[PDB]
Design a protein around this ligand. Structure first.
Ligand SMILES: Cc1cc2nc3c(=O)[nH]c(=O)nc-3n(C[C@H](O)[C@H](O)[C@H](O)COP(=O)(O)O)c2cc1C
Ligand code: SF4
Ligand code: SF4
Ligand code: SF4
Ligand code: FES
Ligand code: FES
Lengths: 115, 164, 121, 239, 435, 139
């Protein structure tokens, strides 16, 4: 359980559907979510922020999400010189997911037999 | 025969609340608030004593005044205080000490419990009697047979019969 | 008696009239009411994606718009979001009758479109 | 629900739309008004089913949205109830069908008699399956439940819409083999009238049967009510 | 006290023209005993006719077997401001049953006279007949008979010169077996979808338009003047205790001579089928199973069938029912599972969907049966199916849930070996690719 | 008055109720909140949800408390094995065709169906077939 990240579908669409299960389950209160219906009628987030300086990396968010959207990536070397850099927004989380998707998918191909 | 939710630990909480000597304790106005040790300005604000009404979204009635003796259902709240947003993230910023302590913890079986709690603490309080639900139905559709009685269009007139 | 009410004579403020949230075809009638939140008003943002996405990067909306609808036999389709069901979304059953290539049924979970030429057409 | 009607909601079409035009004929209006007299005026909504049926023959075998609107305006009731009733009953067809409507029972007593054989013969000859219509708009095939002719199973009922309300015919054809139904269809096609009821006996009286759904095997056995009919009689009501 | 039943004499059969061999006009019916002494029977009195029907012990032929004498007395004997209605159930959408069709097509005068007698004996101001929509020629014959009776003064003001006033009207359905229920038929009559009401209230207390109304079967109504004319004592001469009288029987399936015949009650199935029907196609030994009461009652295997009689209180103790006394016969070359699955599909298409359990479980039962037919099911899933049948039974608004649940129940109870054999046998054609 | 308030027994509790009241209303006066889906206070009695089934003495079938009138001397039972069995079966029949839309459904968290399934339902499902797909409507 490492850096939280946002996953997409292979066509390119975000997995997160703003069911807010992750925010509800998070005992750290480190997740702030705002969402509305997209212009196409899709139910998508408008604000997706997780405070890494506040996130406890418990992975309960990864347990609660039923669409495998939020995942703690295998990245653990992400220390920053300033505290502000750790205030993760939707855009940086999506960047991290696009970066680390292949490794996370490979791990899920193993973890699926247990999860 | 006595049966009022008689299969739970609540009976053990019914008693030990009526213990002699322990049931005769009393304190004066603002006296308990002195023992609190909190800043004195806490008592300057106003508080609302009430029971929240049933939500329109659901037919549930457990968290309502109906099961009053079953669960503490009287809440004490404070006037909301100035709130704004974080310039860097946009999260809601506030400085209220009494922001959530009531809506999360303060629960009371009867209104008089909260009245005593406020009096011994010195919190100035407002009482708002919740509206009573009505169980008596309307004259129309009073019983299931009223959906199909003669009140819909009156007695059938036997004028279209053959030979009239 | 009981004359009809003229709805067209009602005056409508120009400023409020021009900021009604409308929608593309997508999953709903074109131009229907779109739900919006107060976020983005202070920054004067009237786009859903613009609230969180910055720059001219390809939006997820453009990505999904590049996938052609899928033709499947039958009347009800099952969507999982992946080849293996446990790796995607909960299974969804989507109606395929009255659907065409022009007017298919879009996935509420994944946004994928489907249609069938089995409803006598 | 029935065949050829996969939608319980309106669908737009140049043939069937909000602009559709329909009006009753004077004979149809008179017949409907006579039917209206069967119920009290304060319960004028009770005659909706026969009126819908009569409109169905009048239009030519199916009911359009405009027809439903006109019926509702005739009976002084909301169109929603009319739509509910139209979608509730099997005989009411909401889509354009052929001149002749062929309905086949699929119930198990009919199935055991070789119903699938008759269906297969109809499919092979007419060239269409259930829910389909011939390119010439002549025959419309549909599947039905038990039609109350199980002793003469298998059986088929064919509805005629070529002669309107006054010339409407609902004829039962029973005790059928593939040859029987094919010849019935051919006789209808050439313009003749196929004989009604069973093809090998008059009514439900004891006779042979269809063995395996392909051949009629006559059999002789005890038959009742073969004597002279009983004379009128009544007992002494007094005591 | 006779113990052997059957062999009903032609001179004792109620319907002399059940096959239409004779003339169908009013002159033939009147010459055949119908519309005879009608006025004087009416003048006897309401309670007199009630007592005569009660002595007969005649049961409701709709499918319940309720005593009609107590049934017809449930109407009030006073007046309160509402008119009294009589409605006759003439749908006959029960699979395997085609007797009321024959009654309405060939003997409409008897039915009309029974309607008049029932209206007199219960005080119904007017009468209504709810015939099945597909029965068009039967409806035309009924209308002709009604008009002919009106032409001779039998109906209307001063009925048959008795002082009472009676009216009869004709309605036809539009293809809904759900309309066969009492409240559902009343609902379709009112001009709504045939969605049944709940009891309480009762149609006699509150029926059509909120007025007292009794719904009756065609056969029960038709036999009444003959029972009144020939005597409740003569009617009770047949059958066992509480099961007196004759009955029309529809025999179908793999029968050498399928027929709709009238016969004395309590007759054995073997006698009723070997005689008057030519026996089983391929012989009695080729018999596999028989449903004796239409499609809603449990079926019986060859062991139960050989020895049991056609009676309400004999088939019930056999965990079955007389139903409509409609006979469906299946041989050894038949797929019983396919038959029950097709029955379930029919019920699924016929469910009105007003209440949750039936509406949502008809498709579930159909899919379970369909998977069973291909063998794509498991042993414990049979007990699962039985549990689901218990779930639906007695938990819905009307009895259609019971009508759908019962056939599969008896199917399992009497042929669980066949189902398990099929389930295992699919492994010889499905597991060979799994390895 | 001719006893406008009649008496019944619900789980051996005498409760005084007005005439014309239902068993649902009696149990409400008894302090029991029977699960229900179609009945409403301000609407006519529908009685199609089958979720108000209860047990009465001398009655072989569960009765529709949302619609069943209360008779004097009636006995009502609400915790018998058949009551829970019927409730669980009804919930199962509710959920077999219902689409798995809770993550995208807006009523999640205030869904009467969800809470009633949690309380009066089971935890597992034996339905593995294709559901019924329904097109949406514009109002
Ligand atoms: C699903 C269902 C279908 C029925 N269909 C018919 C029917 O087609 N004809 C009929 O006479 N009774 C039918 N009944 C029985 C009626 O509900 C009712 O009992 C009958 O009209 C009374 O007839 P009786 O006077 O002989 O007792 C049906 C009942 C049910 C539950
Ligand atoms: S990340 Fe997953 S759990 Fe969190 S809101 Fe998005 S879809 Fe729901
Ligand atoms: S890993 Fe734990 S602390 Fe971090 S976002 Fe998920 S639930 Fe919150
Ligand atoms: S059991 Fe079926 S047919 Fe009968 S009322 Fe309920 S849903 Fe309708
Ligand atoms: S089984 Fe086909 S008409 Fe009855
Ligand atoms: S409240 Fe709907 S069935 Fe009782």
């Amino acid at each position: 359980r490492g850096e939280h990240a946002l996953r997409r579908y292979p066509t390119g669409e975000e997995r997160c559907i703003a069911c807010k299960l992750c925010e509800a389950i998070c005992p750290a209160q480190a997740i702030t979510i705002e969402a509305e219906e997209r212009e196409d009628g899709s139910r998508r987030t408008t604000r997706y922020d997780i405070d890494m300086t506040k996130c406890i990396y418990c992975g309960f968010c990864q347990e609660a999400c039923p669409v495998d959207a939020i995942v703690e990536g295998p990245n653990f070397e992400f220390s920053t010189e300033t505290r502000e850099e750790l205030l993760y927004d939707k855009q940086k989380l999506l960047e991290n997911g696009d970066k680390w998707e292949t490794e996370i998918a490979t791990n899920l191909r193993t973890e699926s037999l247990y999860r | 025969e006595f049966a009022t939710a008689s299969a739970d630990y609540s009976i053990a909480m019914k008693k030990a609340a009526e213990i002699t000597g322990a049931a005769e304790s009393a304190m004066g106005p603002k006296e308990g608030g002195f023992t609190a040790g909190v800043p004195l300005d806490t008592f300057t604000r106003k508080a609302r004593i009430y029971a929240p009404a049933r939500t329109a979204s659901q037919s549930g009635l457990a968290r309502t005044v109906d099961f009053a003796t079953t669960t503490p259902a009287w809440k004490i709240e404070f006037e909301p205080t100035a709130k704004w947003q974080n310039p860097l993230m946009g999260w809601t910023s506030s400085a209220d000490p009494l922001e959530n302590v009531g809506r999360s913890a303060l629960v009371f079986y009867t209104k008089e419990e909260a009245m005593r709690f406020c009096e011994k603490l010195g919190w100035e309080y407002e009482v708002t009697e919740p509206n009573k639900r009505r169980t008596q139905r309307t004259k129309r559709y009073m019983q299931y047979g009223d959906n199909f009685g003669t009140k819909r269009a009156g007695v059938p007139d036997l004028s279209t019969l053959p030979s009239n | 008696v009981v004359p009809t009410f003229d709805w067209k004579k009602v005056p409508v403020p120009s400023t409020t009239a021009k900021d009604i949230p409308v929608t593309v075809k997508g999953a709903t009638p074109a131009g229907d009411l779109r739900a919006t939140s107060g976020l983005g008003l202070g920054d004067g943002i009237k786009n859903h994606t613009d609230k969180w996405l910055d720059g001219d990067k390809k939006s997820p909306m453009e990505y999904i718009n590049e996938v052609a609808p899928i033709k499947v036999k039958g009347l009800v389709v099952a969507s999982y979001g992946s080849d293996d069901p446990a790796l995607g979304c909960p299974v969804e059953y989507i109606n395929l009758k009255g659907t065409s290539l022009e007017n298919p049924a879009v996935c509420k979970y994944t946004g994928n479109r489907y249609y069938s030429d089995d409803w006598k057409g | 629900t029935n065949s050829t009607d996969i939608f319980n909601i309106h669908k737009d079409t140049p043939e069937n739309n909000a602009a559709t035009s329909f009006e009753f004929s004077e004979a149809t209006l008179k017949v409907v008004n006579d039917i209206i007299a069967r119920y009290p005026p304060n319960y004028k909504q009770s005659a909706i089913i026969p009126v819908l049926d009569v409109t169905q023959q009048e239009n030519g075998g199916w009911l359009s949205l405009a027809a439903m609107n006109r019926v509702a305006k005739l009976l002084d009731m909301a169109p929603i109830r009319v739509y509910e009733v139209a979608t509730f009953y099997t005989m009411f067809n909401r889509t354009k069908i052929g001149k002749y409507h062929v309905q086949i029972c699929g119930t198990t007593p009919c199935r055991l008699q070789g119903s699938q054989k008759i269906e297969e013969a109809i499919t092979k000859h007419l060239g269409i399956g259930i829910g389909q219509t011939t390119q010439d708009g002549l025959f419309t095939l549909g599947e039905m439940e038990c039609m109350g002719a199980c002793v003469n199973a298998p059986m088929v009922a064919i509805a005629d819409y070529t002669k309107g309300v006054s010339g409407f015919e609902y004829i039962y054809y029973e005790d059928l083999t593939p040859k029987d139904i094919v010849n019935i269809l051919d006789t209808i096609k050439k313009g003749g009238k196929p004989k009604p009821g069973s093809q090998y006996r008059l009514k439900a009286e004891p006779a042979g049967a269809v063995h395996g759904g392909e051949k009629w095997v006559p059999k002789d056995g005890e038959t009742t009510l073969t004597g002279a009919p009983r004379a009128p009689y009544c007992r002494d009501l007094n005591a | 006290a006779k113990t052997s039943f059957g062999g009903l004499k032609d001179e004792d059969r109620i319907f002399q023209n059940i096959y239409g061999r004779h003339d169908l006009s009013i002159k033939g019916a009147m010459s055949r005993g119908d519309w005879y002494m009608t006025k004087e029977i009416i003048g006897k009195g309401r309670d007199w006719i009630i007592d005569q029907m009660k002595k007969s012990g005649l049961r409701g032929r709709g499918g319940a077997g309720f005593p009609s004498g107590l049934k017809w007395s449930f109407m009030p004997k006073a007046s309160d401001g509402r008119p009294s209605y009589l409605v006759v159930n003439g749908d006959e959408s029960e699979p395997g049953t085609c007797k009321d069709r024959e009654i309405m097509r060939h003997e409409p005068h008897k039915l009309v006279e029974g309607c008049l007698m029932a209206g007199v004996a219960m005080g119904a101001r007017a009468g209504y007949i709810y015939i099945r929509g597909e029965f068009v020629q039967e409806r035309r014959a009924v209308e002709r008979a009604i008009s002919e009776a009106y032409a001779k003064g039998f109906l209307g003001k001063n009925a048959c010169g008795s002082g009472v006033d009676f009216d009869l009207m004709v309605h036809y359905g539009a293809g809904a077996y759900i309309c066969g229920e009492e409240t559902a038929l009343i609902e379709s009559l009112e001009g709504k979808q045939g969605k049944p009401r709940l009891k309480p209230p009762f149609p006699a207390g509150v029926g059509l338009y909120g007025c007292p109304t009794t719904v009756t079967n065609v056969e029960t109504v038709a036999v009444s003047p003959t029972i009144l004319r020939r005597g409740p004592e003569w009617f009770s001469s047949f059958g066992r205790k509480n099961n007196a009288g004759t009955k029309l029987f529809c025999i179908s399936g793999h029968v050498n001579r399928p027929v709709t015949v009238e016969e004395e009650m309590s007759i054995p199935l073997k006698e009723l089928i070997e005689r008057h029907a030519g026996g089983v196609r391929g012989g009695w030994d080729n018999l596999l199973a028989i449903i004796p009461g239409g499609s809603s009652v449990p079926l019986l295997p060859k062991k139960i069938c050989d020895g049991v009689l056609m009676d309400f209180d004999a088939l019930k103790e056999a965990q079955s029912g007389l139903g409509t006394a409609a006979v469906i016969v299946m041989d050894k070359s038949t797929d019983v599972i396919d038959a029950i699955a097709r029955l379930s599909y029919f019920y699924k298409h016929e469910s009105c969907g007003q209440c949750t359990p039936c509406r949502e479980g008809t498709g579930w039962l159909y899919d379970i049966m369909t998977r069973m037919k291909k063998g794509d099911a498991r042993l414990e899933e049979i007990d699962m199916l039985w549990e689901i049948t218990k779930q639906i039974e007695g938990h819905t608004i009307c009895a259609l849930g019971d009508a759908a649940a019962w056939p599969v129940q008896g199917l399992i109870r009497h042929f669980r070996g066949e189902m398990e054999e099929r389930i295992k046998s699919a492994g010889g054609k499905k597991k060979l690719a799994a390895t | 008055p001719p006893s406008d308030h009649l008496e019944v027994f619900v789980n051996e509790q005498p409760v005084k109720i007005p005439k014309g009241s239902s068993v649902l209303q009696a149990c409400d006066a008894a302090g029991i909140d029977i699960p229900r889906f179609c009945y409403h206070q301000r609407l006519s009695i529908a009685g199609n949800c089958r979720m108000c089934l209860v047990e009465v003495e001398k009655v072989p079938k569960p009765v529709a408390s949302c619609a069943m009138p209360a008779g004097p001397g009636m006995k009502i039972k609400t915790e018998t094995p058949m009551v829970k069995k019927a409730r669980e079966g009804v919930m199962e029949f509710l959920l077999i065709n219902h689409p798995l839309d809770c993550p995208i459904c807006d009523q999640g968290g205030e869904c009467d169906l969800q809470d009633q399934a949690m309380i009066f339902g089971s935890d597992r499902s034996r339905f593995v077939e294709a559901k019924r797909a329904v097109e949406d409507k514009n109002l």
